[PDB]
Protein backbone atom coordinates (compact mmCIF):
# COMPACT_ATOMS: atom_id res chain seq x y z
CA UNK A 1 0.00 0.00 0.00
CA UNK A 2 2.86 2.40 -0.89
CA UNK A 3 2.24 5.89 -2.32
CA UNK A 4 3.66 5.58 -5.85
CA UNK A 5 3.49 8.77 -7.95
CA UNK A 6 0.70 8.84 -10.56
CA UNK A 7 1.72 8.35 -14.22
CA UNK A 8 1.32 11.44 -16.48
CA UNK A 9 -2.10 10.25 -17.77
CA UNK A 10 -3.24 10.18 -14.09
CA UNK A 11 -1.14 13.01 -12.51
CA UNK A 12 -3.80 15.48 -13.77
CA UNK A 13 -6.34 13.67 -11.51
CA UNK A 14 -5.31 16.30 -8.90
CA UNK A 15 -4.77 19.84 -10.19
CA UNK A 16 -3.33 23.11 -8.77
CA UNK A 17 0.09 21.47 -8.25
CA UNK A 18 -1.59 18.56 -6.40
CA UNK A 19 1.04 15.83 -5.90
CA UNK A 20 -0.90 12.76 -7.08
CA UNK A 21 0.00 9.32 -5.67
CA UNK A 22 -1.71 5.90 -5.87
CA UNK A 23 -2.01 3.26 -3.13
CA UNK A 24 0.04 0.43 -4.68
CA UNK A 25 -1.51 -2.87 -3.52
CA UNK A 26 -3.12 -5.75 -5.46
CA UNK A 27 -6.72 -5.16 -4.32
CA UNK A 28 -7.94 -1.66 -5.26
CA UNK A 29 -8.42 -0.55 -8.91
CA UNK A 30 -6.27 2.64 -8.62
CA UNK A 31 -7.33 4.42 -5.39
CA UNK A 32 -5.65 7.85 -5.31
CA UNK A 33 -3.95 9.84 -2.53
CA UNK A 34 -3.09 13.45 -3.44
CA UNK A 35 -0.73 15.54 -1.29
CA UNK A 36 -2.41 18.77 -2.39
CA UNK A 37 -1.02 22.29 -2.02
CA UNK A 38 -1.91 24.24 1.18
CA UNK A 39 -5.31 25.89 0.59
CA UNK A 40 -7.22 23.54 -1.78
CA UNK A 41 -10.31 21.31 -1.44
CA UNK A 42 -12.39 18.86 -3.49
CA UNK A 43 -11.56 15.30 -4.66
CA UNK A 44 -9.30 16.73 -7.41
CA UNK A 45 -8.16 19.74 -5.26
CA UNK A 46 -9.87 22.05 -7.77
CA UNK A 47 -11.42 24.64 -5.42
CA UNK A 48 -9.07 27.08 -3.65
CA UNK A 49 -9.81 27.92 0.03
CA UNK A 50 -8.58 30.85 2.21
CA UNK A 51 -4.76 30.85 2.36
CA UNK A 52 -4.84 34.57 3.21
CA UNK A 53 -7.86 36.63 4.41
CA UNK A 54 -9.34 35.67 1.02
CA UNK A 55 -12.27 38.10 1.19
CA UNK A 56 -10.53 41.47 1.78
CA UNK A 57 -9.61 41.72 -1.91
CA UNK A 58 -9.41 45.51 -1.35
CA UNK A 59 -6.65 44.96 1.25
CA UNK A 60 -3.03 44.68 0.04
CA UNK A 61 -2.99 40.87 0.57
CA UNK A 62 -2.99 40.29 -3.22
CA UNK A 63 -0.26 42.89 -3.92
Distance CA 54, CA 15 (A): 20
Q: Quick one: the chain helix, strand, coil %, rounded to 5? A: 5, 30, 65
- Which of the four CATH numbers 2.60.40.180, 1.20.140.10, 2.10.25.10, 3.40.50.2000 does domain 1-63 have? 2.10.25.10
Beta carbons of 40 and 48 less than 8 angstroms apart: yes
C-alpha 16 chain-centroid distance: 6
Under DSSP, the state recorded for 16 is T
Beta carbons of 33 and 23 less than 8 angstroms apart: yes
Helical H runs in 1-63?
Answer: 8-11
Half-sphere exposure of 3 (CA within 13 A, CB side): 8
* Structure-determination technique: NMR
Burial state string for 14-35 with b = 16 or more CB within 10 A and e = fewer than 16: bbeebebbbeeeeeeeeebebe
Distance CA 41, CA 20 (A): 14
Distance CA 19, CA 61 (A): 26
Domain spans in the chain, listed from the N-terminal domain onward: 1-63
Amino acid sequence: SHLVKCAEKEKTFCVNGGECFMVKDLSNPSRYLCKCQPGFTGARCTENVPMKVQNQEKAEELY
